[PDB]
């Protein structure tokens, strides 16, 4: 293809073992998630990736993932830019809740709908929510490209794409078209949104895409920045399939 | 004072204890040097610093120092910009040599000129030098604002200032004048060059300035972007003076 792009979601964060929706809560990587980022960097080094620019969200776990990757590559000097527009989907009032408990109380199908639907919007987070203040009082959201009171209080995946697309179009895509090799260090839902756009995945088919943590995703793009074929997970496909199943199973009872 | 910013040189790596000139060799911090960066971050957190921009060199030890400080502050989202123009001074053929060996071979006075004078230039690095290829083959120097073939093969402190000052004037200083809170994560001699300029230190007097590793310098500048007074170090002054003496003593024969 004319261009190649790498994107990924970070490895396990500090709420993964507790199986809680994390979203805009700024949890750090845990020890396993740090190792996943190192493994990504080693895999990218083995394939000779030489990045020219890295894009991340403003959540520290995506930034630390980038930094660990760049250290493994010996590319710490490569410019990094961060934007809330690559943040994980805002899960609203579901932030902090246990996915398995939700499946037990409401049905696995209900949790699957909440997690993977394109159109369904979670209930908005309210000021009484235990995690409201630590999100909206953070300085990183006082200096972003929209006013604090305009930031979402919950998002469908469609909403994520709507706020990610301007950043892709205005900032990332022009660099790809210059022939620069780009790394996008983001999150499960923000990566799914961008894949939906670049691959032309239907609203119905995007529900069945679950991305494994800490696995580089190669996208080959044509002159119009449309995918030439489906995304490719770089690694051992058996391990990758088990990693996908692991994410799916977070929403299953027992 | 009208403006304030933080500058520092990173903590130690292996060649600090071994007493070897490191310069453009891209050596990593060791454990102690990582802890020095965390300690700087804790001091800046105590002072409630809220950075808007961080500037570093392209040597990974300065970048990792910045990342560790930002992590201590919970400010990993703050933009970082890295430039060869903040790199440590290029020590030429002295790269990788032991400073005390140089004092034994050439005398303490000559070593002090090489390390601290303004105008004396180290002998240039040649293609046969054991560290030449790993410096000049590195992609970070193929994508600079100067062609690979025009990058220095050694630098006096004057040469450092000549390549650093445009970056200060054109990229960093405008952000200071916009009221932004800036961190500069740099190196011993690039920091000394900037201090010489900002404080108006004479060509003769700069030879007496040595900076300790891993110690924040909180610089105070007036409306014309010149220092209000001599630089000061955050931390325990007796420990800082002992650390300065240790750096000076690297270039001395042991009595």
From Swiss-Prot, chain A:
It comes from the Eukaryota. Changing residue 89 to C: In ECYT8; mutation identified at protein level; marked decrease in synthase and mutase activities; no effect on phosphatase activity. Substrate binds at residues 9-16, 22-23, 61, 88-91, 99, 115-116, 188-189. Its EC number is 5.4.2.4, 5.4.2.11. Glycans are attached at residues 2, 4, 17, 42, 158, 196. The modification Phosphothreonine is found at residue 121. At alkaline pH BPGM favors the synthase reaction; however, at lower pH the phosphatase reaction is dominant. Inhibited by citrate. One of its GO terms (biological process) is oxygen transport. The keyword Transmembrane helix does not apply. SUPFAM superfamilies: Phosphoglycerate mutase-like (SSF53254). Keywords: Acetylation, Congenital erythrocytosis, Disease variant, Glycation, Glycolysis, Glycoprotein, Hereditary hemolytic anemia, Hydrolase, Isomerase, Phosphoprotein. Expressed in red blood cells. Expressed in non-erythroid cells of the placenta; present in the syncytiotrophoblast layer of the placental villi at the feto-maternal interface (at protein level). GO terms for cellular component: cytosol; extracellular exosome. The active site is at residues 10, 88. It is linked to Erythrocytosis, familial, 8: An autosomal recessive disorder characterized by elevated serum hemoglobin and hematocrit, and biphosphoglycerate mutase deficiency. ECYT8 affected individuals manifest hemolytic anemia and splenomegaly. Homodimer. Plays a major role in regulating hemoglobin oxygen affinity by controlling the levels of its allosteric effector 2,3-bisphosphoglycerate (2,3-BPG). Also exhibits mutase (EC 5.4.2.11) activity. This is Bisphosphoglycerate mutase. It comes from Homo sapiens. The lineage of its organism: Eukaryota, Metazoa, Chordata, Craniata, Vertebrata.
Swiss-Prot record, chain B:
The modification N-acetylserine is found at residue 1. Its EC number is 5.4.2.4, 5.4.2.11. The record marks 28, 45, 142, 180, 245-246, 252 as: Not glycated. The keyword Phosphoprotein applies. Glycans are attached at residues 2, 4, 17, 42, 158, 196. The keyword Transit peptide does not apply. One of its GO terms (cellular component) is extracellular exosome. InterPro entries: His_Pase_superF_clade-1, His_PPase_superfam, PG/BPGM_mutase_AS, Phosphogly_mut1. GO terms for biological process: carbohydrate derivative catabolic process; carbohydrate metabolic process; cellular response to stress; defense response to protozoan; erythrocyte development; establishment of blood-brain barrier; glycolytic process; neuroinflammatory response. Expressed in red blood cells. Expressed in non-erythroid cells of the placenta; present in the syncytiotrophoblast layer of the placental villi at the feto-maternal interface (at protein level). Substrate binds at residues 9-16, 22-23, 61, 88-91, 99, 115-116, 188-189. Keywords: Acetylation, Congenital erythrocytosis, Disease variant, Glycation, Glycolysis, Glycoprotein, Hereditary hemolytic anemia, Hydrolase, Isomerase, Phosphoprotein. The active site is at residues 10, 88. Coiled coil: none annotated. At alkaline pH BPGM favors the synthase reaction; however, at lower pH the phosphatase reaction is dominant. Inhibited by citrate. It holds the Pfam family His_Phos_1. The record marks 187 as: Transition state stabilizer. It catalyses: (2R)-3-phospho-glyceroyl phosphate = (2R)-2,3-bisphosphoglycerate + H(+); (2R)-2-phosphoglycerate = (2R)-3-phosphoglycerate. Homodimer. Plays a major role in regulating hemoglobin oxygen affinity by controlling the levels of its allosteric effector 2,3-bisphosphoglycerate (2,3-BPG). Also exhibits mutase (EC 5.4.2.11) activity. NCBIfam families: pgm_1, PRK14115.1. It is linked to Erythrocytosis, familial, 8: An autosomal recessive disorder characterized by elevated serum hemoglobin and hematocrit, and biphosphoglycerate mutase deficiency. ECYT8 affected individuals manifest hemolytic anemia and splenomegaly. This is Bisphosphoglycerate mutase. It comes from Homo sapiens (Human). The gene is BPGM.
């Amino acid at each position: 293809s004319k261009y190649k792009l790498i994107m990924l979601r970070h490895g396990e964060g500090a709420w993964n073992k507790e199986n809680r929706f994390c979203s805009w809560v700024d949890q750090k990587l845990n020890s396993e998630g740090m190792e996943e980022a190192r493994n990504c960097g080693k895999q990218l080094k083995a394939l000779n990736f030489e990045f020219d620019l890295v894009f991340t969200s403003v959540l520290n776990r995506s930034i630390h993932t980038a930094w660990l990757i760049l250290e493994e590559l010996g590319q710490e000097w490569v410019p990094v830019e961060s934007s809330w527009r690559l943040n994980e989907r805002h899960y609203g009032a579901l932030i902090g809740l246990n996915r398995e408990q939700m499946a037990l109380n409401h049905g696995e199908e209900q949790v699957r709908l909440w997690r993977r639907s394109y159109n369904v919007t979670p209930p908005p987070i309210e000021e009484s929510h235990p995690y409201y203040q630590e999100i909206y009082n953070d300085r990183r959201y006082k200096v972003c490209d929209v006013p604090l009171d305009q930031l979402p209080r919950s998002e469908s995946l469609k909403d994520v794409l709507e706020r990610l697309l301007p950043y892709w179009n205005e900032r990332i895509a022009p660099e790809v078209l210059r022939g620069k090799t780009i790394l996008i260090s983001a999150h499960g839902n923000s990566s799914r949104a961008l894949l939906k756009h670049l691959e032309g995945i239907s609203d119905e088919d995007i529900i069945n895409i679950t991305l494994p943590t800490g696995v580089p995703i190669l996208l080959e793009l044509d002159e119009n920045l449309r995918a030439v074929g489906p995304h490719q997970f770089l690694g051992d496909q058996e391990a990758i399939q088990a990693a996908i199943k692991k994410v799916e199973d977070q929403g299953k009872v027992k």
